[PDB]
Symmetry: C3
Subunit: 303 residues, 3 copies
């Protein structure tokens, strides 16, 4: 068997993504029914930059698969510093059955996956956040049923990891994806091109616009994210793209709202939207647990 990895959303085909999302629903119903890591077998969970919420979901999910997560956070040097990435992959492959890694550049994830003899999962990177989008898709399916043909609009910084993963993971699910963002913060054209190509296979589509009202019109799902990872109002370009009540009122009447969290209330999203009946952000956060477990189960049995 070829060792399978999950570094970006389109690493799964449409049929494979459906398998993972079905497993995510099964594991939400029966969270300790799959024990591929019984022993326990180990899974490495490595953070080049800390993300506490990413750690809750993986550390508990791995335990519920019977395994033991070995968590390495930023306070432990950095992978690649005092020995080669390739040497690190070879040793980790002797201790664990999968490697979950939060890092920056995609080329590091690619290099890890090409040498490691166990599955590598992108927990969060500069370019993609594919585990979050699996959780988003599970949440949408819970609220609306079939994903094919839904219209999803993302608002704010369209150049970030969530914009890229909503494009790739969304069109893989057959969802018509719109990114609404100011012209200096648009999807990477290579990512957009890959999303357009995948969308041809699923009947989906890709739209990029700087007109937030047009992007909201008739949408089934509205998504946003913090505008920056960290005087001058540097986020001024994004404020017209705030997910507020006026924007939500332009979408379909049964539309839902997603936000990967943490939220900066009053910036990219308002209290009224976050706390209103369209919000699915709390189920979405919970589904990180289930969708990541499903991904691990699926990768381990193909690898």
């Amino acid at each position: 068997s070829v060792i399978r990895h999950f570094l970006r959303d389109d690493d799964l085909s449409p049929a494979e993504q459906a398998e993972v999302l079905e497993l995510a629903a099964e594991l939400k119903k029966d969270p300790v029914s799959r024990r591929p890591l019984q022993g326990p077998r180990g899974v490495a969970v490595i953070f080049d930059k800390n993300s506490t919420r990413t750690r809750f979901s993986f550390e508990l999910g791995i335990a519920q698969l019977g395994g033991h997560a070995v968590v390495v956070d930023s306070g432990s040097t950095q992978l690649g510093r005092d020995e080669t990435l390739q040497d690190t992959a070879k040793v980790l492959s002797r201790y664990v059955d999968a490697i979950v890694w939060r890092t920056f550049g995609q080329e590091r994830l690619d290099a890890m996956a090409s040498v490691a003899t166990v599955p590598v999962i992108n927990a969060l990177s500069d370019e993609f956040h594919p585990c979050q989008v699996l959780a988003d898709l599970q949440t949408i399916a819970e609220r609306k049923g079939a994903l094919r043909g839904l219209r999803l609009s993302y608002f704010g910084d369209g150049a970030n990891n969530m914009a890229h993963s909503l494009l790739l993971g969304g069109v893989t699910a057959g969802i018509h994806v719109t990114v609404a963002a100011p012209e200096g913060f648009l999807p990477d054209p290579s990512v957009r091109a890959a999303a357009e190509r995948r969308a041809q296979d699923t009947g989906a589509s890709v739209t990029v616009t700087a007109d937030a009202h047009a992007a909201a019109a008739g949408a089934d799902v509205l998504v946003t994210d913090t505008w920056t990872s960290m005087g001058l109002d540097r986020v001024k370009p994004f404020r017209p793209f705030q997910l507020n009540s006026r924007l939500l009122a332009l979408a379909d009447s049964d539309a839902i709202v997603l936000h990967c969290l943490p939220a900066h209330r009053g910036d990219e999203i308002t209290d009224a939207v976050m706390d209103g009946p369209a919000s699915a952000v709390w189920d979405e956060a919970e589904n990180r647990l289930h969708a990541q477990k499903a991904l691990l189960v699926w990768l381990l049995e193909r690898s």
Copy 2:
């Protein structure tokens, strides 16, 4: 209907007795209760690290079948509202154990979270330590009601407050001996006096260490702080002279860490009256009992 444990008197006298009975049962049979089998998660969050709090809660949770997710010292409230954090945590874990500074943050967390919240240690109270202390006293002396306990040193800190509230809840006559600038918060002292009326207990605050030692069944101290700035406390040192004024079978407690030569001497801490190591062990058993009890009422 979700119960929390933020300060000692959050348990009634009857409820405290239930938790302490469970603590003795779990010490005998440490893996006999598995309410967190799965594993289910419990959050263990430190705004400031504590090694003994980490060992006792992390292993206790594991022995209940659970998995502790331990978060060390971005601080809660900085990247998102405490209320948003409380909602996300409630989807991931069955209880939240939190070491933080101000009591108002614990109150805020408990008012929003839909799972039990436990104060692992705060500026104002250390109620899990006092559960361990009460378990230790009971196994050395039997019935708690009517015992005389004196605490010495900094009478304004979390241990003084919790020994007052938790002690009188158990029916113990509690004395705090401290210099006048370091006495119990009057609101806490009043709450302990009111609770003592239900249990036959009493509250005494004094600056006379020798009077407080006389007739005591249990002597307790704690580090004085967390130029001799601690000079005010040195007359309140728990030493052999002070111990010799107490009952001949008195025992000595100290929440740890100890600064030997300051609040307690080597001779007392390593001598036959010391119960400090059993007391430390009982952090594990008493906190396990508390979690079992809160989980079944929530």
Copy 3:
């Protein structure tokens, strides 16, 4: 029972070391067949300086014995600062069944072992790396069989923890150990004397030389380690020319991380003589065997 510790390689007798290494092979074959820590019981894994590869091997090994590792990284209050190491050891002994510690000076390990009522294990220290050498010996045995009478040569910094442990652990196994190192980086004289005395009981021997080529001739095993002060060590590089002077079926060991191009070349590291990846894996099995063995004697 006498509580057994493992702070340096000669804390095991020759017969005891053979028992641990036999157990390591058994546990490599059947990794979850021994569950002395079921419950879970706890094991402390404490780092004064982080070592992620020590963390992986111990944390998963403890889990595979059925236990729960409580892992403490650097950046909490360094042990010894807010209470004595002895007090820390006495409290840890009430929470866990063994203490695994990566620290600096040997006197710190001695301090905890002096009062602990559970086994204390040196995970890695300034003076010794005895768990790595157990893994090394397991690796050598599974490729070459009987250890007595083999020839092992270590190259480079002969004053560091690996040189010391290869001396002590090697002669305990009956191996003729050579340290090839430059002046100013030679073994500590008390360690050298202890290894010479232990070699008398096993038929082993100790050689210390600046002649790297002579040290390679006839060797079954060539070992090196990071040099960190680079100029003195260049003649001791483990390169293809040096390896060719050894036995035709010699194997190469290196406690990771390797600095390729410095103490070892890519050709050696990635060639057919390299046993470094099996060596790293065997930290898991050898440490699990050590824990099983210490627990059942303590």
